[PDB]
């Protein structure tokens, strides 16, 4: 009956011991990420929990079920953050991105809600100033809540990504050797990593500014840790190794250039300049001044360390003592005018999403994914459809 829709629906939204169980344990914790090379996905196949949450929340606000919606959203926030926190392994990149979408979606909705409450005259005019004050306070608090959530999951995810990159890229970039015609992670693993991030953020309709931020952060991180690994290497810094490093770095730069990134070079600067230092001739004082010209991001002390641990090969002229003396004199000169290491950016970072104009919210169609095992939620949505038809 149409006479008993909103009634039953009400009695469904009033029970936050059943609904909370299905939502937090079934929908959120029991989430399934869709398939992303070139695979096209409609926006409805990605942010389905966001859509469902938006439906339940909207219908709760319609019926004035305030405290219940507050508990609901509290447990939802806690659950989402917990889920992102427990992310590990091969699913780190897609799942993360997945949630980064959903949360963002939610945020937009709330913004819209607030922008409806304050702009549209009908709301401020149609109800008491006390109730209006309550709703404004509530919705605002929720907006800030989701802001904080997105910040949290972004920084958590990014920190995890860094924790894996530290485990792969050191050996891949510094130690791994693969040159054309000269004959346990490689550069291909790194490229596969960054490609995973790209295709995931692309197929899941994520704003490119976030991609820019993430990859820039990760690149700077790689640059830092690999440089801090290289400078303490000894019986290792040879011309061949400089060539190899230059090769790997060049691969990364190529990926950046062919995937939108313009500022990919400045991130890897220390490694580039390091390879250049290891490759160029360093036999004359002029060659050293040239080296200073090229390596602008490298400090004189770092130059001294790098040069002093260079490995001269067989049939290669060793670096003169006059040169080393000149280097020490330069370092002394710089001391007359704080460590040789680079401090890696571990976090926290500014949420890139908090710098982008929030997505304009459009009307969500009443739908719940058929493959889910959430009875109450499905009954809710099904009722909501008939409700909208009625209005």
């Amino acid at each position: 009956n149409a006479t008993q829709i909103n009634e039953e629906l009400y009695r469904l939204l009033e029970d936050t011991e059943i609904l909370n169980q299905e939502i937090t344990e079934g929908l959120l914790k029991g989430f399934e990420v869709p398939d992303a090379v070139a695979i096209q996905l409609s926006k409805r196949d990605v942010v389905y929990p966001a859509r469902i949450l938006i439906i339940v929340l909207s219908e709760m606000w319609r019926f004035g079920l305030t405290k219940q919606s507050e508990s609901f959203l509290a447990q939802v926030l806690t659950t989402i953050q917990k889920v992102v926190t427990q992310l590990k392994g091969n699913d780190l990149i897609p799942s993360g991105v997945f949630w980064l979408a959903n949360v963002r979606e939610l945020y937009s909705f709330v913004v819209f809600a607030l922008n409806s409450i304050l702009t549209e005259e009908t709301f401020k005019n149609g109800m008491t100033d006390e109730e209006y004050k309550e709703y404004v306070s509530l919705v605002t608090e929720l907006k800030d809540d989701f802001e904080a959530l997105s910040y949290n999951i972004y920084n958590i995810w990014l920190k995890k990504l860094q924790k894996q990159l530290q485990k792969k890229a050191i050996n891949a970039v510094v130690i791994s050797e693969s040159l054309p015609g000269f004959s346990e992670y490689t550069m291909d693993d790194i490229l596969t990593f960054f490609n995973s991030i790209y295709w995931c953020m692309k197929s899941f309709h994520i704003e490119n500014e976030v991609f820019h931020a993430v990859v820039t952060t990760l690149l700077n991180y790689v640059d830092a840790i690999c440089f801090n690994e290289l400078i303490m290497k000894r019986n290792f810094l040879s011309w061949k190794r400089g060539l190899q490093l230059n090769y790997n770095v060049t691969r990364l730069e190529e990926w950046c250039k062919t995937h939108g990134l313009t500022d990919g070079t400045e991130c890897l600067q220390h490694l580039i300049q390091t390879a250049k230092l290891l490759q160029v001739r360093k036999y004359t004082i002029e060659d050293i001044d040239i080296l200073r010209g090229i390596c602008y991001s490298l400090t004189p002390a770092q130059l001294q360390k790098l040069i002093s641990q260079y490995q001269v090969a067989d049939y290669e002229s060793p670096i003169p003592q006059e040169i080393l003396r000149y280097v020490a004199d330069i370092v002394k000169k710089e001391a007359a005018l704080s460590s040789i290491f680079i401090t890696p950016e571990t976090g926290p970072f500014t949420d890139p999403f908090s710098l982008i104009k929030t997505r304009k919210f459009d009307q969500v169609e009443a739908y719940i994914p058929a493959w889910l095992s959430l009875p109450s939620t499905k009954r809710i949505v099904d009722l909501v459809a008939q409700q909208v038809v009625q209005d």
Binding site: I55, W61, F63, E131, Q363, A366
Partner: peptide, 15 residues
């Protein structure tokens, strides 16, 4: 007197 908050967020389309 609570007017409630009916943000018409939800739509329905039939092919």
């Amino acid at each position: 007197f609570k007017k409630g908050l009916n943000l018409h967020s939800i739509k329905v389309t039939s092919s």
